[PDB]
Amino acid sequence: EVCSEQAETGPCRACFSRWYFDVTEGKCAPFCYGGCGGNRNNFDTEEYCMAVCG
């Protein structure tokens, strides 16, 4: 269920380089995490995202 969540920047406006599992691609993609809030589909690196979600 974690890996099905949509990418969420959250309300804050930083750009922490993060990755989320994109269910439409079956693999992870990068996004700006704003630095607060968000959801669990949020990983430091592509390899880590795929380790959890791939």
Binding site: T9, P11, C12, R13, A14, C15, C32, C36
Partner: protein
């Protein structure tokens, strides 16, 4: 910045870039040794880049200076976003010149209706991702606190104010946080948060720098 324009090169000499391998947040130079940013932009190591216009092109007129101290407001809270302000001490003083200079701290709270200038390298799209290499600018008015509080019921603390446009389309966005809101020659705001970017009736929420003038003075003095 959504709905803005490319700033004239080096015309906002107080704008800085915070870099930790890539640009991740903005900031404002407030003295030769100190930069103001957002507490949610905290990293344990930060390179400050002053004099920037294109963050991807090393023209040679930038000043890259490592942060010696990185101090979030001690009462920053990631759930409420209260006290979203941070101070960075440069490891060597910034050299003041035509492209690098300070922005005055505010002497009174922001006044609704005042025209301001918001700036940064943030996303330019409300849906999608288009991140600019060149610094973007947005002319935007201070909104009334009633407009701010009605847009975000129960979420606007004493430390916050709204700047922008309730009709949508013009706002700061991800990668703008920490950057300046300047009104009448003074740094009134720090880019903080919002629901989405440039959504109708969801304006940008900014840290009210005036409420932290004493904290800024005290922290600078304690860390000299």
């Amino acid at each position: 910045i959504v709905g803005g324009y490319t700033c004239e090169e080096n015309s906002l000499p107080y704008q800085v870039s915070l870099n930790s391998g890539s640009h991740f947040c903005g900031g404002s130079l407030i003295s030769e040794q100190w930069v103001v940013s957002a507490a949610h932009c905290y990293k344990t190591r930060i390179q400050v880049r002053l004099g920037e216009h294109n963050i991807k092109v090393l023209e040679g007129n930038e000043q890259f200076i490592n942060a010696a101290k990185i101090i979030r407001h001690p009462k920053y809270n990631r759930d409420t976003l209260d006290n979203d302000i941070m101070l960075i001490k440069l490891s060597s003083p910034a050299v003041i010149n035509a492209r690098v200079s300070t922005i005055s701290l505010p002497t009174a709270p922001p006044a609704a209706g005042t025209e301001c200038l918001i700036s940064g390298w943030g996303n330019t799209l409300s849906f999608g991702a288009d991140y600019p290499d060149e610094l973007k600018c947005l002319d935007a008015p201070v909104l009334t606190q009633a407009e701010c509080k009605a847009s975000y019921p129960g979420k606007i603390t004493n430390s916050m104010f709204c700047v922008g446009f309730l009709e949508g389309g013009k706002d700061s966005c991800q990668r703008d946080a920490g950057g300046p809101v300047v009104c009448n020659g003074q740094l009134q705001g720090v880019v903080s948060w919002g629901h989405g970017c440039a959504w109708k009736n969801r304006p940008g929420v900014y840290t009210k720098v005036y409420n932290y003038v004493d904290w800024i003075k005290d922290t600078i003095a304690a860390n000299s």
